[PDB]
Amino acid sequence: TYLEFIQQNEERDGVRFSWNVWPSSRLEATRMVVPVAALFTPLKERPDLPPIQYEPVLCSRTTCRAVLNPLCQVDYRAKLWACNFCYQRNQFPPSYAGISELNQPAELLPQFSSIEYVVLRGPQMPLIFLYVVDTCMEDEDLQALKESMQMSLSLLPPTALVGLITFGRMVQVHELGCEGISKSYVFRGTKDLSAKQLQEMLGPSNRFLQPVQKIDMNLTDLLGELQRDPWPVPQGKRPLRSSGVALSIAVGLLECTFPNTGARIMMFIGGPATQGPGMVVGDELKTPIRSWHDIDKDNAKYVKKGTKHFEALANRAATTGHVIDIYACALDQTGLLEMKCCPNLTGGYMVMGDSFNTSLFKQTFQRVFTKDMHGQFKMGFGGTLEIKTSREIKISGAIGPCVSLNSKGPCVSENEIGTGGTCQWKICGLSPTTTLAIYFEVVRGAIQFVTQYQHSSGQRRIRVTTIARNWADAQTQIQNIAASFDQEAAAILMARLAIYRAETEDVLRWLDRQLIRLCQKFGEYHKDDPSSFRFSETFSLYPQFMFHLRRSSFLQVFNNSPDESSYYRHHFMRQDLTQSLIMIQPILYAYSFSGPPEPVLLDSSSILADRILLMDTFFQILIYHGETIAQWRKSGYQDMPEYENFRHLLQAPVDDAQEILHSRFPMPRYIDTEHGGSQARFLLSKVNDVSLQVFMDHLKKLAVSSA
Amino acid sequence: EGLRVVNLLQERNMLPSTPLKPPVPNLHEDIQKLNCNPELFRCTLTSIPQTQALLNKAKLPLGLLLHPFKDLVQLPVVTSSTIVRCRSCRTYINPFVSFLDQRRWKCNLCYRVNDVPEEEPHRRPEVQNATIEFMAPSEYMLRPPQPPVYLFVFDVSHNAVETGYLNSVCQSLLDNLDLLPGNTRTKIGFITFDSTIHFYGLQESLSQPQMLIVSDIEDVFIPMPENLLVNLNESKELVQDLLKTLPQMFTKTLETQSALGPALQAAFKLMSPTGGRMSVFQTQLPTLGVGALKPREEPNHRSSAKMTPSTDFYKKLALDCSGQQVAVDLFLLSGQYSDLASLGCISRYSAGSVYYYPSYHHQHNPVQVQKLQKELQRYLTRKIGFEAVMRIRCTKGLSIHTFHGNFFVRSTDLLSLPNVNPDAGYAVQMSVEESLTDTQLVSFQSALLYTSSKGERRIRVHTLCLPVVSTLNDVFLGADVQAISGLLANMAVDRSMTASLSDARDALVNAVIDSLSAYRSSVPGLMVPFSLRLFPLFVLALLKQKSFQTGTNARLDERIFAMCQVKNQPLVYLMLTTHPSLYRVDNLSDEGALNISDRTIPQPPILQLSVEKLSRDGAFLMDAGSVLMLWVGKNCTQNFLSQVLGVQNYASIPQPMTDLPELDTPESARIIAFISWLREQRPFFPILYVIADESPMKANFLQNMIEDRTESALSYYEFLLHIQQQVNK
Amino acid sequence: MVLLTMIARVADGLPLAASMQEDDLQQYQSQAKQLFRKLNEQSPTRCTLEAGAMTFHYIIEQGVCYLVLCEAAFPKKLAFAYLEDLHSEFDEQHGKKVPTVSRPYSFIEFDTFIQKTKKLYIDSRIMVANIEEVL
Ligand SMILES: [Zn+2]
Ligand SMILES: [Zn+2]
C-alpha cells in the first residue's frame, strides 16, 4: 500500500517525498511538474533508537566518504563492504573484524536506516542563554515578563551560562555577582558596536556569562528589582527603544567570548525599535507603524534600512553558530518584519502576542524549555547538515531555517532553489519538529542525510539517514511515477516554493500554471470537454490544497499587519507535513446530538445552528455555537439537571481542544464565540476565484484546452 | 617709627625679634580707625604716587593683595531693603564717602553726588564698617540660589590602589558627612575612573548602590537621568555604604592607564545643570584619551633655567566649568611625574585650588598620610560659596591692569568664581592712568557676590582708603615690603611661563637693584629706607624658595605646586613659607603672653635664618606656616631629652616622630603652650614633626637657612654685596 | 511638556520658591518675572497665557502665585492639577509665614517637594490670553 509506505517512511526516516518513484529518463526528469523534493525532519523522535557510541564507518574514497548504511553490499567472508554510492570496496575497520552473519552491526539493519551516533572525544561545552530584556513597557507587563524569566531560569541546568542585557534608551550589559555593588556597562543605544569594539570596551565562563548554579541567586535578586527605563516619555511620543543596538551588542558579546558553540540569544521586546540602527518607526505617536498598504506605496522609509541591519546581525550570528529568539508582546506592531531574518536564518523562535501578562505567552514560553524522558531540553545546537546523493541526483537547494556553508561538489546542481549552491547547510538551532525542504534534480537511487549537532546535554551527535527510491521502469514511466505521488507533501513543497518567491519578490500565476500542467499530464480527460476531467486517488486532493493555499494568509498579505505575515510564514517554513497541512487547510469537526464528533468539510454548508464546531487552524482553536445551541446556552439549559446531555455537548469541543492545546509549541489562540458574535469572522473567512466548486469548474475548463 | 636710613652692610641684624606688623597708612586718626583690616585688604604702597611718572621712578610695583573670603570673628550684616550705591560707578556706600548736604553723599571713587534715600545717616552700619555683608535682592541673581553639590572623582588605577589614598578620603568623608556646608538641599555624587568611567546610582529602593560603566572614552555621556547626584539627607545610608565599600572594589585591579580627560568631561556633564564643587583625586600621568600627556624627563641640580602646559585641554575644560558655576579642585597624589603644569589649569581658571602629596603611600609615607588627613578635614568643613563673582573698584585715575589668582576674568574685569573658598588669596596690579592732582585720598573696594550654602545671595564688601603723595621719598616711606615681595612673587610666576625661569629670577633681582638705585640717586654703603630694610632679604628668600630655586634637586611637579601656592595663598602664608620663623625652644620661659587666663605661652625672640644662630647644645622650632620642624642638637641637654621628648638620649629618638608627647612636666607645658599658640593662628592645622635630626635624611631644615651659602646659591651677605655693586655702578 | 515652576508673593513679586533643570531659561524666567510684577488684586486668580511654542499656567491663592511653564502641547488639565498639589502643601507648611518674609527665596528648601511632585506629572506612564499682551 502506497499510503502505508508513506507513513512508515516518515516514522522511520523523518522524510516525505513529493515523488517516491523517480524518472529514469531526461525527458521525464525535465518534464516534471512538481520537482523531486523532500520534507526532511532531521531530529525526528521515534520509538527509542539505541544511541550508538562509536565513530561512523566511512567509505575509504576521498570523494565519497559516505556512511556505512543498510544499502551497502557486505561480504562477511572477505571482510569487505561495497559503497552503494561510489562502488568503492572497503576493508572493515579493525573493530569490525569479528562481525558475523548472525550478529551484524546496527548501521546495517534496515530498521536503522535512520541512526544516531554519539562521538565523545573533546570536552563538552555548557549551554548559553543570553536574556535581552526591553524595559520600555508597563509595570504589569514588565513584572509578568520578569516572572516568565525566573521560571525559565528555574529550568536551566546548573552548568548553563546566563547573561542579562537590559535596554531602552540605553543598553546595559550586566556583570553578575560582582558582590556588594551590582555593576553594568552602559552604552548609547544610538550607534552600532562591532564584536572587536565590544571586546575592547568590556575588557569556562566570563564576567558576563556565568553558571546558573553560581549566579542564579544574584540574578533572582537582580531580575526581581528591575524597573522601567528611567527616561521620561513626553506626551504623544513613543519610548526611545534601542532594539537594534541591543541585539548587535548581544550578538557581539557572544561572538568574542563563546563562538562556535550552542547559545540562545533570547530577546524580549514590548514595542518597535524607535532609535538607532534597525529603527522601525519614528517616535511620533501620530505617525502609525507601516502597513502592507504603506509598503506598497513607498510610504515606509525605515523598512529597507532596518531590514539590512538585522540581516547583517543574523548572518553574523549564523556564521558564529548562535540562535536568536524574538518574544514580541505589544498592542501595536513591533517590527517582526524587519527582524524576521534573525530567527529565520538561525533556527530561532518567533513568539508574538498582545501582552507578556497573558496565559498565552506564559505557557508558550515554558514550552520552549520542555524536557524529555531524561530531564534534558529538546533543543539542538550548531547543526551541520550534509547531503550525499547518487551520481544521477543533484541538489537544487534547501528552503527552511538554515544557511549555506557554500561547499561545492558534484552533488551541487546549477539550477539553484532557495539556499543552493551547496551540499552543506548550517542550522544553528533545531528541535525534533524542525523540518527542511530539499529540492532535487535528476541528471534504485539513494540519498544520505548527515546531521552533526550539539545535543542539549553537551554530547556531539551525528544523525545519519539513508533512503532509497526505485527508478521508473522505462516500459511504464509515467504510470509508475504517477502512483508514487504524495499529494500532501507536494502541496507543502510547492507552497514552500511560492512563499519563498513571494517573501523575496506573479507568484499566483506560477501556482496556477503548475496546477494546470499537473492536470494535463496526470489527469484523465478528453480534449475540450471539462466534464470528462478526473484525477486519480493519488492526485484528487491536490487542487483542493492549491485552492486554500492561494487564498491563504501566506500569499494574500493584505488584511494582516506586516508582522502577522512574517509570523505566519515563519512557522510555516519550519513545520512538518501534518501541521503544515493544517495551516493551509484547517481541519473541521462537528458536535451535535445526532452522533459522535466527526470530520466535516470546510464549507458554509457545515455551519449548522444545532451544532457545535471545532475548527483547528494551526494558530487558533475555535468553538462555534450555532444560532440554535447558542440560544439554548443563553437560556440556561446547561445548568439544569434535566440537561446533563446538553453539558456533554457544550464541553466536548472544549475537552478535545485542551489535548492539542498543550502539544503545539506556539500555544494556539483559544476562541469561543457563537452566531452573532464578533469572533465568528475567523470561521466564516476560513470557510467555503470564488468558491471551491467555481474553482474546479474553471480548472477543468483550462485543463482540457491548450497546453 | 622713624624715617631713618639703613646701611645693610653694617646692620646684618636688621630683622626684628617680634612679628612684623603691616604698615599703618599716613592717614588722619579718625580715617585710619575705620580702615579695612590689613589681613583682608592691603596695598604695596600705602602712600599712592600721584602720577605714573612718580610710580615709574620708584621702580616698585603698585598693586593690591586681598583675602576677601577669610573667616572672620565678627561680621556685620546689613539686611536693608535697598542697598545704597552710587548712581554712576555702582560703588557701595562706605565709611570713606563724604556727606555734605546730609541728604546727599559724594562718591569717593567717581566724585558724583548721590541722593541719600529715605531709608544721622553717617551712623548707619554701612558707613561705620569697612567690612560688611549685604543681603542681595532678587536682581543680583541670574537664577534661583543653587543648592550645594559635591561631586568626588576618584582615580582607581593600579597605581592609585597601591597608594591607598582612597581609604583615608572615604573615611574622611564618613567622619565629616554631616559637617559638609549646606541645608537639606545638599547633593552629593561619586565617580571612579581608570580606562573607563564609572558612575554610581544611589536609590533607597535598592539593596545596594549600582555601578554604571561608560566605556566609550571618545564620546562620554550621562547614563542615568537621576540618582547620580543624590540628596545627601535622603540617601545618607546609601552614601555611607558606598563610602565603606569603595576602598575594597579595586584591590585586584590590573588597569595601569588613566583616562582623566574623559572622566572630567563626564563629571562636567553631570554637574553642568547645577554647578558646585568637583573634587578630583589623581595619582599619575593621564595617558588615555583626550587630555593625555606625554612623559617628561626630570631635571637635576646641574640643569640651567631652560614650565608651561603641554596642552590647552584642561584650560579649555576649566573655562567650560567656569561658565556653569563648577569649580574643580585637584588632589595630586603622584609618586612620579604627572605634568601638573597642565593638570593644574583645571583649577586655575575655575576658581579651584590644587593640593599636592608627592609620593603618597599609606605605609611608606606617614607624613603625607597625616597631611592629607588634616587638609581634608579643613577642605570638607570650611565654609563655601557658590556661583560667585567679584569686582574690584578703585578711584578714578587708578586702573587695575593685571589679575593674579584662581578665577576667570570676564569682560570689563569681572572675576568669575564658581566657588569661593575661605583660604584663597588674590593679587592685583594697578597703575595711575590719570594724575591724582585733584584728590589727596583714594579708595579701593572689592565686592564679593555669592550664594551661601544655605541658599542666600550675599555680598561681602571691603573698602580700603589710602593717601596720595607727590614725592619719591613719601612713596618709599609707605612701602609695604611683604606686600611688595608677594606681588613680585606672583609677577615672577607669570614671567616663568611667559619667558623662562631665568627671566623670572633676573626680574626679581633687578627689582631690588632698580628700586634701591632709584633711592640712592634721590639722597658709601648700601643705603636703604627703613621701610625697605628687609627688601633684599625677602627677595633672596624668594630666589631660594622652591618656586624659583635653581641648583636644587627640585622636580617638575614640585616647582609647579609651589607656584600654585604663590598664586593661590594669601600673603601671610607666602611669607611664613618663604621666610620661616626661627625660635630657640630648649629654654622657653615666661616673658610671653601669660594673659590668656590659665596659659603662659612663651614669646621667644625671632631668630634670623642662619645656621650661625643655631647651636648643637639646644633645640630650635621652625615655623614654615604649613609645618613646624623641631631641630634638636646632637649635644642637647638631658633636661630637654626626657622632660620634653620623653627620651633618655639622642640615639633613641624615634626616626618618624609624628608629634610631641604631652608629658607631665612644666617643660613639655611651655613648649606645648607656645606651639598651640602658633597653630591657633591659622586654619590649616600645621603638623609638627621632630623628625628633624642631625642625620634623619629629612633635615631639609637647613634649606630654610636662606642667609647662608651653598654650592649653588649666594649667601645673604654676598647678596647684599652683589646688590651694592649695581646700585652705585 | 517639560518644566519651569516659580512661587512668588503677588503683592511685590517677591520670589518664594522655584525649580529649574536644563540639562532658553534666561528669556522665560524674565517673562515669568514680568508677570509677577504685573499681577495685583484685579488679576484673574486662574489663567493661562500663550507664549508661541510655550505656555504659562498660574493660579493665585492667599496672595501667593503658583506659576508653571511648559511646551504648549502639555495638557492644560494637568498643569492646574500640578499647581493645586503645590498650593495645598505650600499653604500648609509656610502659608502663615509668607506675609512676613522679606528675603528673596526665603523658602528655597521647598525645592524638594516641587521636584518630587514634578516627576509625577511629566511622565505619561481659567482664562486664555497672549502673554505678550499682558506684558
Ligand atoms: Zn563511497
Ligand atoms: Zn561713584
Residue numbers in the entry:
A (entry chain A): 3 to 205, 225 to 464, 476 to 537, 541 to 723, 746 to 764
B (entry chain B): 346 to 464, 476 to 662, 666 to 882, 888 to 1093
C (entry chain C): 1 to 23, 29 to 130, 148 to 157
Please give me the paper's original passages concerning this structure:
The packaging of cargo transmembrane proteins into COPII-coated vesicles entails a direct interaction between COPII protein and cytoplasmically-oriented ER export signals. About a half dozen export signals have been identified to date, almost all comprising short peptide motifs, all of them binding to the Sec24 subunit of the COPII inner coat. The ΦC export signal was identified in studies of p24-family and ERGIC-53 proteins, and comprises a C-terminal signature of a pair of hydrophobic residues or a single terminal valine residue. The ΦC motif contacts a site on Sec24a that is also the binding site for the LxxLE- and DxE-class export motifs.
A series of ΦC-signal peptides was synthesized, based on a core sequence of yeast Emp24p, and individual peptides were soaked at high concentrations into two crystal forms of human COPII protein: one comprising Sec23a/Sec24a•Sec22b, the other Sec24c. For all ΦC sequences, we observed clear evidence for peptide binding to a site on Sec24a in the Sec23a/Sec24a•Sec22b crystals, based on the presence of residual electron density that matches the peptide sequence (this binding site is occluded in the Sec24c crystals). The finding that multiple classes of export motifs bind to a common site is surprising, but the COPII•ΦC crystal structures highlight that the common molecular feature is carboxylate-group recognition by the clustered arginine residues of the B site—the terminal carboxylate group of the ΦC motif adopts a similar position and bonding arrangement to the carboxylate of the glutamate side chains of LxxLE and DxE motifs. Thus, specific recognition of the ΦC motif involves the terminal carboxylate group bonding to Arg750 and Arg752 of Sec24a, with the penultimate hydrophobic residue of the motif nestling against Tyr496, and the terminal hydrophobic residue fitting to a pocket of hydrophobic side chains.
